[PDB]
Amino acid sequence: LHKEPATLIKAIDGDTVKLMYKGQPMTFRLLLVDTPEFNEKYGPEASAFTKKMVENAKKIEVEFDKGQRTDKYGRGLAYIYADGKMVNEALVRQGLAKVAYVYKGNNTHEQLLQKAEAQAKKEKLNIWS
Ligand SMILES: Cc1cn([C@H]2C[C@H](OP(=O)(O)O)[C@@H](COP(=O)(O)O)O2)c(=O)[nH]c1=O
Numbered sequence: 001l002h003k004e005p006a007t008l009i010k011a012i013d014g015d016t017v018k019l020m021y022k023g024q025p026m027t028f029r030l031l032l033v034d035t036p037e038f039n040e041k042y043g044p045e046a047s048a049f050t051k052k053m054v055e056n057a058k059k060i061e062v063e064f065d066k067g068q069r070t071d072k073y074g075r076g077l078a079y080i081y082a083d084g085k086m087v088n089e090a091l092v093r094q095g096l097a098k099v100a101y102v103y104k105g106n107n108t109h110e111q112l113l114q115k116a117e118a119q120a121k122k123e124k125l126n127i128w129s
């Protein structure tokens with residue numbers, strides 16, 4: 001996989017963010033994770049976590065997997081990195097997202113994220129508390 005540049009337009013929630021990519025505004029949905037909706041428990045905390053990570057970054061990058069790059073709603077599907085740290089993973093490691101939506105051919109970082117989840121769960125963090 002390859003990292004590509006993007007810039008933040010606006011944080012949205014725990015697992016969606018609006019970025020400018022190749023000069024065009026797009027909503028991205030984070031691969032392989034599910035954060036609670038804002039109205040659900042840990043939703044606000046997930047929103048806040050993602051917002052802080054992307055707003056504080058000097059450099060946002062997008063990394064598409066090998067499969068589908070957009071979902072049926074037109075959202076980009078990618079791993080998102082903030083100053084080199086994967087937001088997807090960081091969410092899972094902090095117990096603010098579950099590994100989820102693992103579809104074959106867009107699952108390159110599945111094992112990485114399952115490992116993060118196992119550690120979050122062992123720590124009894126957030127969703128696992
Ligand atoms: C994360 C991801 C979501 N989706 C679609 C599946 C779900 O369809 P439904 O809307 O029919 O449930 C929805 C979940 O996104 P949200 O968790 O953002 O609601 O997005 C994909 O198609 N591919 C993906 O990789």
Ligand SMILES: [Ca+2]
Pocket residue numbers: 015034035036037
């Ligand atoms: Ca969600």
